[PDB]
Write a protein that binds this ligand. Structure first.
Ligand SMILES: CCCCCCCCCCCCCCCCCC(=O)OC[C@H](COP(=O)([O-])OCC(O)COP(=O)([O-])OC[C@@H](COC(=O)CCCCCCCCCCCCCCCCC)OC(=O)CCCCCCCCCCCCCCCCC)OC(=O)CCCCCCCCCCCCCCCCC
Ligand SMILES: CCCCCCCCCCCCCCCCCC(=O)OC[C@H](COP(=O)([O-])OCC(O)COP(=O)([O-])OC[C@@H](COC(=O)CCCCCCCCCCCCCCCCC)OC(=O)CCCCCCCCCCCCCCCCC)OC(=O)CCCCCCCCCCCCCCCCC
Ligand SMILES: CCCCCCCCCCCCCCCCCC(=O)OC[C@H](COP(=O)(O)OCCN)OC(=O)CCCCCCCCCCCCCCCCC
Ligand SMILES: CCCCCCCCCCCCCCCCCC(=O)OC[C@H](COP(=O)(O)OCCN)OC(=O)CCCCCCCCCCCCCCCCC
Ligand SMILES: CCCCCCCCCCCCCCCCCC(=O)OC[C@H](COP(=O)(O)OCCN)OC(=O)CCCCCCCCCCCCCCCCC
Ligand SMILES: CCCCCCCCCCCCCCCCCC(=O)OC[C@H](COP(=O)(O)OCCN)OC(=O)CCCCCCCCCCCCCCCCC
Ligand SMILES: CCCCCCCCCCCCCCCCCC(=O)OC[C@H](COP(=O)(O)OCCN)OC(=O)CCCCCCCCCCCCCCCCC
Ligand code: HEM
Ligand code: HEM
Ligand code: HEM
Ligand code: HEM
Lengths: 116, 52, 13, 74, 153, 31, 70, 388, 60, 388
């Protein structure tokens, strides 16, 4: 099934908690995708515009600094935060679709993970 | 006071920095010694004839 | 309070 | 609408503001308590040296003779 | 020399004691769970069995002994020893003294061990305070910096 | 060079003190 | 394994121009408020099963002891 | 930068590798005190090795002299009681800090890509630790040591085809006897060095990919060198561990032990309560809970199968559990279940402990059988909560 | 402040002097802690030590 | 080359370091078989470790049980005589191979720059081998074992102020009894792993500065990969060594030993001929030759000082002995002197062996004292022999 916060109270609570956490640290949900994790995220980030990727790096650095200092974003910017305003899922889906097509008919992987 | 400021750009070809202690006043008798110390820490340039 | 995508040149991109 | 970093670089000011969340600043005109930290570290080093000395002696003298042979020797 | 052995071998001990082997008492306070209290209670708790229980002949009832019936009778009989210092030899007195002696024999290092422990716990707590100060001083540069990042969303 | 000699002598003094503290030959030292 | 520069501007202060150990006990009640408010779910999940199982075991042991005690 | 002349003795080839991988290795600047446990398990291993060598200068692996030799170390040797209590309580500390290491990894999903090799080498290290601690615990030759060795090695005859043959080969005879004691001593001496090698490979893999962080995000933007920023943090950790260890050496030196081990081993008598050390208790509990002992050994193998299979699960792009409420609750339930299962191991095999251990094992395996489902379902979160 | 700076200029200008000071302080502190703990021990358990039993030398 | 998709497993990070340092390391194309001797010494060390572990599965470090335990290994253990003969004769072959290693280094002047660190680590390795073999030879607890332990440990009394204290502390109880036996067993088990670490550092330093060649010239023009070209050469060396070592094990296993070690140790009587194993005989001969035992210990220290002082000589431009006739003759004279010195050590102190030893040790130090002179004169050569 597909459970969205409009048709599920539990999903509404889950989304509320995720929004609260991400707003506390001031970073979008897409910023949690590690380029070293999948290597499809690496390609999707390689294809995105430099302004967007630089904003992602700045938000991540701010979050890491706040984590070290053991504090949260001040309530002003916390109210100014916009989590779940995605910038990466469409490109990641395109990359994965292209990889699936290439794998499906002949083709060698365009990139591979080292061992390990 | 003693502190630092770092303006990272990474779009600039050359990095430039200055590290400084606290000097001496005009009338401090040790200002001449500070001038001598600066002389023996002299400047070097990539186009200087002294070389190495 | 949250800015629209019109501002934030990275949001526009 | 020049960016924050560009405005900071192009406009140096003497009213510098730090975080001061878990580390409060000293008032701008004040000597640095440099010696006090050194003496705290000196006490810690007292302790560390004593512990190292204890451990070395304990091991080496464990490898030494024993009450059994000491009592056996007559 | 070491303390003499009452019996040449374990089989000799069992034959003397009707098949029961009186265990070595060197580590009896550490071999038994809750050793000191257990030994004191076992020596002094030679009570009467409850109603309905009959101990097989040749054994004696002891509530604190695992199983109910023990092979030794009550040996700490009131007025069995004459103390050389002028202490009345009651069963509780003998029990406490014997448990103290056995606990020493099982742990002759207690005094030195405790002295070392107290000294080193105190000294290492001082070291911990200094280490915390050292860490807070080293990290004080990072934990109080102000960084301008050119981003809001 | 004189400064180096003084520094070496002071470091030798420190090392001797450390060895003395490690071995504790207070009983041995008759003279 | 590369560095990713961010184009920041960072002001830092000497470690000898700012107090060290005061921030530990500065603003303590709000710290304890946070520690308890954002974690009571986790403590409940960690301890609830343990105390519940202990209570169940003690209840069962005592009931069996009474039943079998003639 | 042409290295015509020497600048820094740290950068010279003699100290260059140490320079890089210890002083200058960049680490995320937001690591908490939960990484000090990884830094501290190595210290525990070093303590174990040194105390073990100095103990082996006094231990006799014969069957008529092992117990008396251990008591000789207790009484006659100057400082010998310190050595023996250090070795025993240090095995306990080693296992405590390694458990904290493992559980931090589980909480922050450090096993996820690209540290599969780090986690797998950690599992191999765990096997080595378990075998070393067991074969070492057999050495003092007490009642508990002898009978635990008998029970556990005899429960290796569950393999269908070979079974008794492997058991006879392992025992060196027909029962746990002098040959097994000597063999166990030699193996106990050897294995810790393989453990040092495995630890070095563990650290090499981690340094290949770099350490994680509480947020679980990519962290090559804000990084600082190891020395001195994390050296002092690990120093605080070490001193706190030293206070803990000193408490556990000088005031409660036998609390973590089992009193029946202070009885010379007697093959003609069995102690009423044969149980392993407290840090084998969860494994023992699973083994006993599953009946049909061959099934128990299969379950014990399956535990390590699950541990090795953790890093190779589905997408689950978000890894840190600070942003995973459901996985956070699941982790806390897992930790509670592991503690409860460890408690069950010491209990007898009577009721209701059988049922409590049978449910606990099922929950423990359900943890591993549920996380891929969590990842699969959460793969489609952004499309549902988006604010477009 | 003044006292700390004064002792600093006394004993923190050469690292060899600092190492000597560290070792001497470790020794003196160890001996002082020994003495204090021993006095606490004597105060706590009085009437139990070996040279206190009334009949120590009468087993002959 | 951007490593997008992986080509070869050998270039993957799991096998990349191994690839470089084992398969792809460039090696001079003209190496003879003595580099094979170095690899062979490594193999001998591994053989010693494995057979020693399996032997320690049966050896009891007690004074009342060691000798009979070894006879147990020989008579009762299934194929135990093979293990013991392999261990003993493998110690002997280890020393033979290391001696050939050292003498090739001396002949080709491999100690010269930039391999000073390689030579120094080799000297440390040799010290570790000496100590390990000595403490191991104490283990079987025979007449030669006990009395050699007594003598070699009691010559440590030559230290001026702390000699007696060190002797008593190392003895553990005024003699070489059970305490010394346990101590020596633990140390003998521990040391080979430090020896493995030293060997790894040795190889790392050499790999930093390449490898010498029979010509002593710069050799970065014609270099080939280590595998398969030198693996097969080393394999030929290994098989020949296996045949040699099998000749020693099976047909003449007690030739390289003394018959006095088959008598149980009796500290009352003294065997008429107390000598160490054949591979300590040159050192024993030097020490015995120089009287005033304090002088003997000082002379052994001087031997190791000279060995460490070889690399740090002044001019020494031409390296190989193929272009140094004077140094070639000096080296052959030194080798003859070393063999004669080894033979002297097995002889009694009666004349003329005292004179012969006091000449041979002097000639040894003379070799170590006349290499710089040859280097200086050779530095003077080129401006005299010019043909124009
Ligand atoms: C000769 C060259 C020495 C050198 O340069 O060393 C490098 C370097 C010093 O370089 P540096 O930065 O120029 O030195 C100034 C630093 O402040 C370095 O000075 P520091 O004050 O930071 O030194 C730190 C040192 C201070 O102590 C000492 O230095 C020794 C006193 O701390 C320790 O040694 C920590 C001891 C921890 C003990 C843990 C015990 C665990 C439990 C064991 C069982 C307990 C049972 C009871 O040494 C270290 O970093 C020391 C690392 C020690 C580990
Ligand atoms: C009903 C509701 C009850 C709610 C209770 C919540 C609570 O107690 O939270 C405390 C705390 C959670 O507070 P948090 O700041 O939200 O989380 C801590 C951060 O993750 C990490 O931040 P952190 O680095 O400040 O915390 C790490 C934690 C680390 O604490 C531990 O490692 C202790 C583990 C005990 C089990 O250390 C401390 O809390 C500060 C003292 C550190 C001293 C050094 C300890 C090193 C190991 C010593 C040897 C052990 C053998 O609980 C735990 O950390 C567990
Ligand atoms: C079955 C479980 C269904 C859960 C459905 C989603 C719940 C999401 C949610 O918000 O749960 C509430 C809470 C975490 O959310 P929150 O209150 O923000 O916690 C931090 C501040 N207290 O608590 C949790 O999320 C706890 C979830 C525990 C799940 C256990 C499953 C077995
Ligand atoms: C996934 C991780 C890797 C896989 C392997 C499993 C790892 C598990 C990690 C956690 C380990 C926790 C170990 C818990 C040990 C519990 C020991 C125990 O049961 O102690 C009980 C004891 C109570 O007192 P006691 O009188 O001994 O009990 C009555 C016994 N007849 O004392 C107390 O109750 C205290
Ligand atoms: C016990 C398992 C209960 C949940 C079953 C459904 C499931 O697996 O959902 C997966 C997802 C997990 O969400 P989680 O990873 O904890 O946090 C968000 C960051 N990825 O959880 C959800 O999306 C839950 C949403 C519906 C509420 C519970 C039904
Ligand atoms: C007694 C002994 C007890 C045990 C001691 C520890 C044993 C460790 C065993 C594993 C050692 C493996 C080698 C580690 C050192 C290493 O790899 O050094 C590499 C380096 C090669 O030189 P270079 O090419 O300049 O490398 C630096 C910049 N690339 O190497 C060198 O330049 C020489 C390094 C020598 C050793 C330094 C430490
Ligand atoms: C003084 C020694 C003089 C000397 O070096 O003579 C040369 C001789 C060379 O030896 P070789 O090459 O065999 O001679 C054939 C010549 N076509 O060199 C030699 O014979 C080497 C003699 C070395 C003696 C060292 C003592
Ligand atoms: C090379 C290093 C080691 C040596 C030489 C060594 C040697 C010994 C010896 C001789 C004993 C018997 C003495 C005694 O019982 O107190 C022993 C016991 C023991 N060892 Fe080790 N050991 C080493 C490493 C380890 C490690 C790494 C562990 C933990 C994983 C460990 C765990 C134990 C345990 C649990 C005992 C039983 C202690 C007891 O109950 O008395 N040892 N070891
Ligand atoms: C001998 C015991 C062990 C030692 C000495 C050891 C050592 C270390 C060290 C030094 C680190 C780097 C510092 C740190 O991140 O905390 C580390 C990290 C790690 N270890 Fe271990 N470890 C041991 C056991 C284990 C085990 C049993 C596992 C799990 C099976 C494990 C899994 C990990 C993981 C996942 C990390 C990465 C931490 C991160 O997220 O950055 N380790 N270990
Ligand atoms: C445990 C015993 C030893 C082992 C395993 C060992 C191992 C090796 C290895 C693998 C090499 C590189 C391959 C080769 O050139 O043969 C080597 C080279 C070398 N070793 Fe050793 N070695 C040992 C003892 C010694 C000793 C005692 C010395 C002298 C003190 C020494 C001095 C050298 C030198 C000078 C080289 C350079 C080779 C060259 O110049 O081509 N080694 N050793
Ligand atoms: C960790 C590895 C090693 C272990 C566990 C070990 C263990 C032992 C044991 C138990 C013995 C006595 C058994 C017997 O009498 O045959 C022994 C003897 C001996 N070992 Fe080792 N050893 C090791 C490595 C070495 C090495 C590297 C050498 C150096 C070449 C060495 C030299 C000797 C010698 C000379 C003897 C006496 C031979 C004899 O029995 O006559 N061992 N070793």
């Amino acid at each position: 099934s597909f459970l969205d916060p409009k048709k599920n109270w539990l999903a509404a609570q889950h989304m509320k908690s995720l929004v609260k956490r991400l707003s506390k640290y001031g970073l979008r949900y897409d910023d949690l995708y590690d380029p070293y994790y999948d290597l499809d995220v690496k390609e999707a980030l390689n294809r995105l515009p430099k302004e967007v990727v630089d904003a992602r790096h700045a938000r991540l650095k701010r979050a890491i600094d706040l984590s070290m200092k053991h504090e949260y974003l001040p309530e002003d910017l916390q109210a100014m935060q916009t989590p779940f305003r995605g910038y990466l899922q469409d490109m990641l889906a395109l990359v994965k679709r292209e990889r699936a097509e290439r794998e499906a008919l002949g083709g060698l992987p365009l990139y591979q993970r080292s061992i390990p | 006071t003693g502190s630092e400021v770092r303006m990272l750009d990474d779009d600039i070809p050359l990095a430039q920095f200055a590290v400084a202690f606290e000097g001496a006043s005009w009338k401090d008798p040790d200002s001449i010694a500070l001038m001598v110390m600066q002389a023996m820490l002299g400047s070097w340039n990539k186009t200087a004839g002294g070389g190495k | 309070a949250p800015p629209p995508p019109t501002a934030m040149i990275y949001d526009r991109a | 609408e020049i960016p924050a970093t560009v405005a900071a670089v192009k406009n140096p000011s003497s009213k510098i503001i730090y975080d001061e969340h878990n580390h409060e600043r000293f008032p701008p005109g004040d000597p640095s308590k440099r010696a006090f930290a050194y003496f705290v570290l000196t006490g810690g080093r007292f302790v560390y040296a004593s512990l190292i000395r204890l451990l070395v002696l304990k091991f080496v003298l464990s490898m030494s003779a024993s009450k059994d042979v000491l009592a056996l020797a007559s | 020399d070491r303390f003499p052995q009452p019996y040449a071998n374990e089989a000799a001990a069992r034959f003397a004691n009707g098949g029961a082997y009186p265990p070595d008492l060197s580590l009896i306070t550490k071999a038994r769970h809750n050793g000191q209290n257990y030994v004191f209670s076992l020596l002094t708790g030679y009570r009467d069995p409850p109603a309905g229980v009959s101990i097989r002949e040749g054994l004696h009832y002891n509530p604190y002994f695992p199983g109910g019936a023990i092979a030794m009778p009550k040996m700490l009989n009131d007025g069995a020893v004459e103390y050389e210092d002028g202490t009345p030899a009651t069963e509780a007195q003998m029990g406490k003294d014997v448990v103290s002696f056995l606990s020493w024999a099982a742990e002759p290092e207690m005094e030195e061990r405790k002295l070392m422990g107290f000294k080193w716990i105190f000294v290492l707590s001082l070291a911990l305070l200094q280490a915390a100060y050292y860490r807070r001083l080293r990290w004080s540069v990072l934990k109080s910096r102000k960084l301008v990042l050119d981003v809001v969303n | 060079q004189p400064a180096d000699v003084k520094a070496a002598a002071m470091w030798g003094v420190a090392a001797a003190t450390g060895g003395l503290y490690l071995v504790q030959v207070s009983i041995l030292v008759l003279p | 394994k590369q560095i990713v520069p961010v184009k920041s501007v960072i002001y830092a202060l000497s470690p000898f121009q700012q107090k060290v150990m005061t921030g530990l006990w500065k603003d303590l009640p709000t710290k304890i408020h946070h520690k308890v408010s954002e974690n009571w779910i986790s403590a409940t999940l960690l301890l609830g099963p343990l105390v519940g199982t202990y209570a169940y075991v003690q209840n069962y042991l005592e009931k069996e002891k009474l039943h079998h005690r003639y | 930068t042409i290295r015509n002349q020497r600048f820094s003795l740290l950068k010279e080839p003699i100290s260059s590798t140490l320079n890089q991988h210890l002083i200058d290795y960049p680490t995320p600047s937001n690591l908490s005190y939960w990484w000090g446990f990884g830094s501290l398990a190595g210290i525990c291993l070093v303590i174990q090795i040194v105390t073990g060598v100095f103990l082996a200068m006094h231990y006799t692996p014969h069957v008529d002299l092992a117990f008396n030799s251990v008591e000789h170390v207790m009484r006659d040797v100057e400082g010998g009681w310190l050595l023996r209590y250090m070795h025993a309580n240090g095995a306990s500390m080693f296992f405590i800090v390694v458990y904290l290491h493992i559980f931090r990894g589980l909480y922050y999903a450090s096993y996820s890509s690209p540290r599969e090799f780090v986690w797998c080498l950690g599992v191999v290290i765990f096997l080595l630790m378990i075998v070393t601690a067991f074969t070492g615990y057999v050495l003092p030759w007490g009642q508990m040591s002898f009978w635990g060795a008998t029970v556990i090695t005899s429960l290796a005859s569950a393999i269908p085809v070979v079974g008794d043959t492997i058991v006879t080969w392992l025992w060196g005879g027909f029962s746990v006897d002098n040959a097994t004691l000597n063999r166990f001593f030699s193996l106990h001496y050897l294995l810790p060095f393989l453990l040092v090698g495995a630890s070095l490979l563990h650290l090499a893999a981690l340094h290949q990919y770099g350490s994680n962080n509480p947020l679980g995000v990519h962290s090559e933007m804000d990084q600082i060198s190891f020395y001195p920023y994390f050296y002092v943090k690990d120093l605080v950790g070490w001193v706190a561990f030293a206070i803990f260890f000193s408490i556990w050496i000088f005031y409660a030196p036998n609390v973590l032990g089992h009193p029946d081990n202070y009885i010379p081993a007697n093959p003609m008598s069995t102690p009423p309560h044969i149980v392993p050390e407290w840090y084998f208790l969860p494994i023992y509990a699973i083994l006993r809970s599953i009946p049909d002992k061959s099934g128990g050994v299969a379950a014990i193998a399956l535990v390590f199968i699950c541990l090795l299979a953790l890093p190779f699960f589905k997408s689950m792009y978000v890894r840190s559990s600070s942003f995973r409420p459901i996985y956070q609750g699941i982790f806390w339930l897992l930790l509670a279940d592991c503690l409860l299962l460890g408690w069950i191991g010491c209990q007898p095999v009577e009721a209701p402990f059988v049922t409590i251990g049978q449910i606990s094992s099922f929950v423990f395996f359900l943890f591993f059988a549920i996380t891929p489902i969590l990842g699969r379902v959460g793969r489609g979160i952004p499309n549902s909560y988006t604010t477009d | 402040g003044g006292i700390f700076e004064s002792l600093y200029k006394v004993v923190m200008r050469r690292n060899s002097v600092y190492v000597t000071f560290v070792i001497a302080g470790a020794f003196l502190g160890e001996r002082a802690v020994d003495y204090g703990i021993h006095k606490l021990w004597e105060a706590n358990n009085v009437g139990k030590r070996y040279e206190d039993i009334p009949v120590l030398g009468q087993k002959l």
